[PDB]
Design a protein around this nucleic acid. Structure first.
Ligand SMILES: Cc1cn([C@H]2C[C@H](O)[C@@H](COP(=O)(O)OP(=O)(O)OP(=O)(O)O)O2)c(=O)[nH]c1=O
Ligand code: SF4
Ligand SMILES: [Zn+2]
Lengths: 1010, 66
DNA sequence: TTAAGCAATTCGTAATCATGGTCATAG
DNA sequence: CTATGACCATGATTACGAATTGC
């Protein structure tokens, strides 16, 4: 629809180009100037034109040591290494490499690993023509033949085999989303006859570019173009949609320029004639071929930078591609920027111990960038459900019906289009509100990796990139060590608690950035690790090296500076600047998203240390990891000895303090005073006192005062939070307990939060007992919503769940009769509830889908929920304040309340009536019993105040759907399984149905036909 | 039949007769006739040549827990 | 060709081991 | 018609894997 502005008057012999790049690309090419791999770079100007840039003359290489013989110091054998062996038996050694310009170069460099000296050594630099020839050469120089005139006897290892685009960016100092400049007279626009579809197309040599480091005025962001879209399909009853039978009926698109607070384009393409919508364009077609063609032409002409959505990768784009393949439309799958290239669906998997394992499809688009917001949420955030409704409530606050809204009239289709446009608008709001893209651009500028790697890869490519960028400045080469496999080492210490309930303030002192500052201030690195022999026979121990608790020796900083101290120092300053910016916000959600930014930079700095100990990885050095955790243990026991030893009764202070807890970075010391001001004063004195026994940047700091405190086990405690004194209290802290885990029911987590509220804030155990009694009583009397009963568990890799029978695996692998095409896959979460049956050996035989027990009305196992979900967390919490008469107190508060329980063949009812007063079954329909008659006005009085309260609950719920829907004049259709509103509006109809019929036992209060 | 099942499905979604997914089909036909909006005399003449069948004398979504 | 670490607590299922109610037949 | 231990049946203890959170 709307086009980019027109590039007026660029003349290359006088004017430069200044543009900001988004994507890079590799390309094997003809039309050479009179190398074959030429590079592509796509970007945008400071105004809004689209620029493609072709870069020429770059070829991959690596290094290898020159062996000590008469060969690789003699030029005849250098060019003979270039020369091929013409023998017949060298077909395995000069064919797959063959005649390639590997070349011969002599340079003086060093290896990374260890500390041998300040002296370098000769290495050979071996270029290669193509990037897809470094793999057979590696298969032909190490295990292949290297008998060539006795120049290089086998073997010499390969060093610095890295990726092509990463080697380019390490070479020329270009980072992700960078400002690039072509100077005047260096670039030719009309040298390249147009093979792509951008406006400006330059054709430059790889030594002409100028990279501007992002800082000062070069810290801006260009006006990018962002698209979001959503589709609709018309299915059958029960049957989930399939790309060979179910047509695509509506596509809806939103588009904006980045930096402007509203969109500028709003389009909706439908398949029958429709009705107009104010604010958007509407076009209609009588066939699906025209609809797919129209969308492909719009996406070529608008030419967006970024494409977003929600689950567009695994549902939307391959559905469109398969549907275009079935209907024989040849011109659809050309969505990219290159004019002669069609797109294809390709599977990929990712797995780690940090995010688990996920299997995704990818679809190829060259030039353009994809950001599915579902994958960003699934990677960064740990939530309970990952539906669009659930995250839109958590962050903002909100198939067979559609097939008859489309086979109807045109106002129904207009309603369908407004629904689809709201769906297509929600991920834009989430992208701009959560500060996604600004943090992605800052991550790519601090680490130096492209913008497509932050959605596909892990935390290794970034630390490899930063280490290579720091390695070119002193002249070192990296080695290739690979081992399967070493052993584990010893991790962190935890101090033994003094368990219980405390009501005198405890002050928390901890170290900030512990492991990066250990690695900084004792000069630990790959490049300064001293081997056990190379100290000998030199004897200089003092101020030349140090010794660690695991046992290594490491050189002092008066000889070398390591590489990991400098990378860590850069990351630490970036996080410090993020916190300094975060210290001046007032909005809460903005404060937590800047907390998210600084959390991400601290995770990056700690993954630098975790790179060293990963024995399945790219470069492990477990000696360093052992030295780190040994220093950690030594320093925390130093802290505990010092804190408990100095402030004592004989040293003039009030009370000798005693440490109650410590977990590898923090110390919770109990001081003795019950005044929060005096505890805060002594705690600040203690933190600042103890910090002066270390190198720098090692510092201990005061952080909080808990008052009161509740310690249950290791990694399980709770307390109340004081930041200042006249800032009285902030909130609770629930570390580890049953209120922050997601393996349980909402009922149990709510009861634990409410019990700690009534028990820690108001200090009333009697209201707490009465609360827990009411929860258990309302459980047994069958008046608890089934939202509070839903359990969710993650469906991981299928073989570990083959090894032992679980409940959620049994529910998932059991398909439905309605739909063998929508079922949980690997990596998602399965929700279930437990119904009552008589198979007590197996709780995996009583699990059912919440919607299935909704539509089929199966009962609930109240004894399962009473003794297996609720009871034992309560016995954790309520015991330490009292004795074991407290277990008997809650099991007796159960006992007064356990005696109140509410209740094929089911069709053959008799429906025996019963007396309302004393429950005696009898013949006739009158409500009262003959012995309980003198008391009937009171029994009518009783239960009409129950009908009165059910009437008041019907009306508050069924008009809330009208305000959440938007309209007051049309029907509600919302079966949202993540809304408590749904199925709480279903049971009050039946409560009212039952309670209205019980009062017609009594006669009518008058006539009605008068 | 199979042509009489689309006439009723077309009467059920025309907005000028009312917002009807809680009641029967013949009750909505007589409600519009009282106010006399314009009920057509064909959605009546198939609700008379049938008995109490639940796929003629019921709204489209008379399943569906809404 | 691809993947940052360790410590600790909780719950469910099958298997191992203890103990009583019938029973079957020798006295 | 009546003792005795062999036989079936039901409940208490231990072991280990899976899931998830704290540093
Ligand atoms: C959270 C976390 C901690 N650690 C280690 C490194 C840390 O130095 C040590 C302390 O944990 P943390 O206190 O969680 O982190 P931190 O001390 O480095 O930073 P800050 O005080 O500002 O919050 O625990 C990891 O190795 N990986 C991790 O993911
Ligand atoms: S059931 Fe009602 S309140 Fe709940 S999400 Fe649906 S429309 Fe909104
Ligand atoms: Zn009675």
């Amino acid at each position: 629809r709307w086009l980019r502005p027109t590039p007026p008057a660029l003349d290359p012999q006088t004017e430069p180009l200044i543009f900001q790049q988004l994507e890079i690309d590799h390309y094997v090419g003809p039309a050479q100037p009179v190398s074959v791999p030429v590079l592509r770079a796509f970007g945008v100007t400071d105004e809004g034109f689209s620029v493609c840039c072709h870069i020429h003359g770059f070829a991959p290489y690596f290094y290898t040591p020159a062996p000590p013989g008469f060969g690789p110091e003699h030029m005849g054998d250098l060019q003979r290494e270039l020369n091929l062996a013409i023998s017949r038996d060298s077909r395995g050694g000069r064919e797959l490499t063959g005649p390639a310009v590997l070349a011969v170069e002599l340079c003086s460099r060093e290896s990374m690993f260890g500390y041998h000296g300040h002296g370098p050594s000769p290495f050979l630099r071996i270029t290669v023509a193509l990037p897809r020839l470094v793999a057979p050469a590696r298969r032909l120089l190490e295990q292949g033949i290297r008998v060539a005139g006795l120049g290089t006897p086998s073997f010499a290892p390969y060093e610095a085999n890295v990726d092509f685009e990463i080697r380019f960016m390490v070479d020329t100092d270009i980072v992700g989303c960078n400002w690039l400049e072509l100077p005047a007279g260096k670039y030719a626009l009309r040298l390249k006859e147009k093979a792509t579809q951008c406006q400006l197309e330059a054709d430059v040599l790889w030594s002409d570019v100028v990279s501007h480091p992002p800082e000062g005025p070069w810290q801006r962001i260009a006006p990018l173009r962002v698209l979001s879209f959503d589709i609709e399909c018309a299915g059958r009853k029960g049957i989930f949609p399939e790309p060979e039978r179910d047509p695509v009926i509506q596509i809806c698109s939103l588009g904006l320029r980045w930096g402007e607070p509203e969109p500028f384009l709003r389009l909706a393409l439908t398949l029958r004639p429709c009705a107009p919508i104010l604010g958007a364009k509407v076009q209609s077609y009588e066939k699906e071929e025209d609809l797919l063609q129209a969308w492909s032409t719009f996406i070529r002409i608008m030419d967006p930078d970024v494409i977003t959505g929600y689950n567009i990768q695994n549902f939307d784009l391959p559905y469109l591609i398969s549907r275009a393949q079935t209907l024989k439309v040849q011109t659809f799958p050309f969505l990219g920027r290159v004019a002669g290239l069609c797109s294809n669906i390709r599977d990929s998997s990712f797995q780690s111990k940090q995010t688990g394992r996920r299997d995704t499809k990818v679809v190829s688009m060259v030039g353009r960038v994809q950001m599915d917001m579902l994958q960003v949420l699934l990677r960064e955030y740990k939530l309970r459900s990952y539906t669009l409704n659930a995250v839109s409530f958590h962050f903002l606050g909100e198939h067979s019906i559609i097939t008859d809204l489309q086979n109807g009239n045109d106002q129904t289709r207009r309603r369908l289009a407004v629904y689809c446009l709201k769906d297509a608008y929600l991920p834009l709001r989430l992208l701009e509100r959560l500060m996604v893209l600004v943090n992605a651009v800052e991550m790519a500028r601090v680490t130096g990796v492209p913008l497509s790697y932050l959605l596909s890869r892990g935390q290794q490519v970034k630390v490899v990139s930063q280490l290579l960028r720091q390695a070119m400045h002193e002249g070192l080469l990296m080695p290739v060590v690979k081992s399967e496999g070493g052993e584990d080492y010893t991790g962190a210490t935890v101090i033994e608690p003094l368990k219980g309930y405390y009501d005198v303030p405890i002050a928390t002192l901890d170290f900030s950035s512990l492991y990066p500052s250990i690695m900084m201030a004792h000069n630990l690195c790959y490049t300064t690790l001293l081997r056990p022999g190379t100290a000998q026979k030199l004897g200089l121990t003092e101020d030349q090296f140090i010794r660690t608790p695991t046992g290594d020796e490491f050189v002092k900083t008066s000889v070398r500076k390591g590489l990991l101290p400098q990378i860590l120092e850069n990351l630490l300053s970036a996080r410090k600047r993020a916190k300094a910016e975060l210290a001046k916000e007032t909005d809460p959600l903005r404060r937590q998203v800047l907390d998210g930014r600084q959390l991400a930079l601290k995770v990056s700095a700690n993954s630098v240390y975790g790179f060293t100990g990963a024995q399945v990885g790219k470069l492990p050095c477990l000696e360093i990891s052992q030295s780190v955790t040994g220093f950690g243990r030594q320093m925390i026991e130093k802290t505990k000895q010092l804190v408990e030893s100095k402030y004592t009764v004989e040293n003039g202070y009030s009370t000798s303090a005693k440490v109650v807890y410590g977990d590898t970075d923090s110390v919770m010391c109990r001081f003795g005073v019950s005044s929060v001001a005096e505890a805060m004063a002594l705690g600040r004195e203690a933190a600042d006192w103890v910090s002066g026994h270390f190198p720098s940047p090692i510092r201990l700091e005061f952080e909080k005062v808990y008052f009161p405190y509740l310690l249950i086990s290791k990694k399980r405690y709770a307390g109340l939070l004081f930041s200042s004194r006249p800032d009285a209290h902030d909130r609770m802290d629930c570390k580890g307990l049953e209120a922050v885990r997601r393996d349980n029911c909402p009922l149990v987590a709510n009861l634990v939060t409410a019990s700690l509220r009534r028990l820690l804030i108001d200090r009333d155990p009697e209201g707490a007992v009465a609360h827990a009694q009411d929860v258990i009583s309302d459980l047994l009397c069958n008046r608890i919503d089934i939202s509070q009963l839903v359990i969710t568990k993650e469906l991981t890799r299928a073989a570990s769940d083959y090894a032992g029978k679980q409940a959620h695996v049994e529910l998932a692998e059991r398909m439905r009769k309605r739909d063998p095409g929508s079922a949980p896959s690997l990596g998602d979460r399965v929700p279930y509830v437990i119904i009552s049956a008589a198979k007590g050996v197996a709780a995996y035989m009583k699990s059912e889908d919440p919607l299935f027990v909704l539509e089929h009305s199966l009962p609930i196992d109240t004894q399962y929920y009473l003794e297996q979900q609720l009871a034992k967390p309560l016995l954790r919490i309520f015991e330490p304040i009292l004795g074991e008469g407290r277990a008997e107190a809650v099991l007796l508060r159960g006992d007064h309340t356990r005696c109140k329980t509410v209740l094929g063949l089911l069709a053959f009812a008799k429906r025996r009536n019963c007396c309302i007063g004393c429950r005696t079954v009898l013949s006739h329909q009158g409500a009262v019993c003959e012995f309980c008659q003198p008391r009937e006005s009171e029994l009518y009085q009783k239960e009409v105040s129950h009908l009165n309260a059910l009437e008041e609950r019907f009306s508050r719920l069924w008009t809330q759907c009208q305000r959440c829907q938007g309209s007051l004049h049309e029907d509600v259709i919302c079966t949202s399984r993540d809304c408590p509103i749904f199925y709480m509006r279903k049971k009050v109809r039946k409560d009212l149905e039952d309670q209205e019929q019980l009062l017609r036992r009594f006669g009518p209060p008058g006539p009605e036909a008068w | 039949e199979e042509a009489e099942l689309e006439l009723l499905r077309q009467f059920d979604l025309a907005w000028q007769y009312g917002p009807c997914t809680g009641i029967t089909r013949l009750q909505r036909w007589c409600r519009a006739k009282q106010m006399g909006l314009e009920p057509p005399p064909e959605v009546w003449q198939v609700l008379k040549t049938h008995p109490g069948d639940p796929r003629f004398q019921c709204s489209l979504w008379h399943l569906y827990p809404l």
